[PDB]
From a paper:
β-Lactam antibacterials, that is, penicillins, carbapenems, monobactams, and cephalosporins, target the penicillin-binding protein (PBP) family of transpeptidases. Multiple crystal structures reveal that boronic acids react with PBPs to give tricovalently linked complexes bonded to Ser294, Ser349, and Lys484 of PaPBP3; benzoxaboroles react with PaPBP3 via reaction with two nucleophilic serines (Ser294 and Ser349) to give dicovalently linked complexes; and vaborbactam reacts to give a monocovalently linked complex.
The reaction of Lys484 is notable and may in part reflect a low pKa for this residue. The phenyl rings of 1 and 2 occupy similar, but distinct, regions at the active site. The tetrazole of 1 makes hydrogen-bonds to the backbone NHs of Gly534 and Gly535 and is positioned to hydrogen bond with the Thr487 and Ser485 side chains. The direct hydrogen-bonds to Gly534 and Gly535 are unusual for PBP3 inhibitors that occupy the carboxylic acid binding pocket, that is, the pocket binding the C-3 penicillin carboxylate. However, although the observed densities were weak, in the complexes with 1, 3, and 13, unique conformations of the β5-α11 loop were observed.
Numbering used by the authors: 57 to 191, 212 to 493, 501 to 561
The structure:
Amino acid sequence: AIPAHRGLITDRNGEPLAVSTPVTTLWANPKELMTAKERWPQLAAALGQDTKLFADRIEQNAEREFIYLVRGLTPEQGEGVIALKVPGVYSIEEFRRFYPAGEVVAHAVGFTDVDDRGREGIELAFDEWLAGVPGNAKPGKTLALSIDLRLQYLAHRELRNALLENGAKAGSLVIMDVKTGEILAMTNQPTYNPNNRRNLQPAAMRNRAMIDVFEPGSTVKPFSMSAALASGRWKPSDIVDVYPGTLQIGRYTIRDVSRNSRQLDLTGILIKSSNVGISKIAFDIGAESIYSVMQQVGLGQDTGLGFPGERVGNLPNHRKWPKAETATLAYGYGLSVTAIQLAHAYAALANDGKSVPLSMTRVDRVPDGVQVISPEVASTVQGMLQQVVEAQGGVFRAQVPGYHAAGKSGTARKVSVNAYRSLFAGFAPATDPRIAMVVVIDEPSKAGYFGGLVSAPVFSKVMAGALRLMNVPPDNLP
């Protein structure tokens, strides 16, 4: 068994993220080692093993012709042991992974097990590509991720800082190229150092962006509005009366977060994030039109990325949608999603209504993608989301230094097989979008409206650095 050199994983610009490092494994023929017992204590010490524990192992395995003494010493230490020239003691050249960016890209890249086989992340998803063929040994193949390590560092730092400053324990941030479907960053907190998994807590190893399923709440109101503007029955200057901030449908009451409104135009329904206003539109156009937009932008659908235990969530269908179910779909409690799905959906909206498949590998030839929302409707909804960020009473903390930005805040409700998440989903620049981003901050109470307050500022700082690192021309003009 002659171990193969595992393929290099790089970022999209060739920066190393996972590198095969030479190590030396030692195995022994007991019966041959048995001829040199006065050497055993100097061998044991050079192995970092206990004199008597080492001797027992040789004696107790006297019946075997093969045992491992030690796996993955450094090549130096390996030479040190071999230079003792003890009978029965053979070396295998192995490879161990080094992760130059460590905790910063831990969940995306993942790690290898004792046998140098992928256990998590890309290491597992592309295991065959990376592994090559043991011996003639064929070396594994190089893989360039979609991840831009510069954006990844910025995302990791700003999400970590925001969580520490606001007492929060956990969260995620996804950045996508809306044109290419490329995941430019995916960071989760807490994180772990894949180069040192000794103390590693299972909590730190959760790939939240792909695994945590939640009712996305107000962040899907834009998809309800997209269905409205595609129906033929609604234009932006149309008015809905949402007074007095509540709507009774049989036994159920729809309640608005802000109840200071009567007439709202469709932009105002998104700025105020009125559940009554989006519900009244939903009753008029029918739940099926909304369900169809949400399905077409990938909400509650397989991502196709091959991450182990990535979740699909759920977009329930009905033959008949009663009023309560229609309303709860329209304002985001009738489905459950992951942060990756939500970012993919915002990417479609930002890309003038064209969905492009998700990729965690560098995209050279962009797929054709699917026109899921008309360019006219996508353009209209982009302008409405720019007002959500820019207009009076809007999400001003999402405003991006030097650019126009667009998006929607929300309170998500955790789904498990409750607890809450503070969301901000958006894209920039607002008039010619390039990047879509979702920030998820885990929260114990529902109140506070922490989407606008803690997630939005992370969006502001990360979107600003991302656009500049990508040389996107500022659209805040002199």
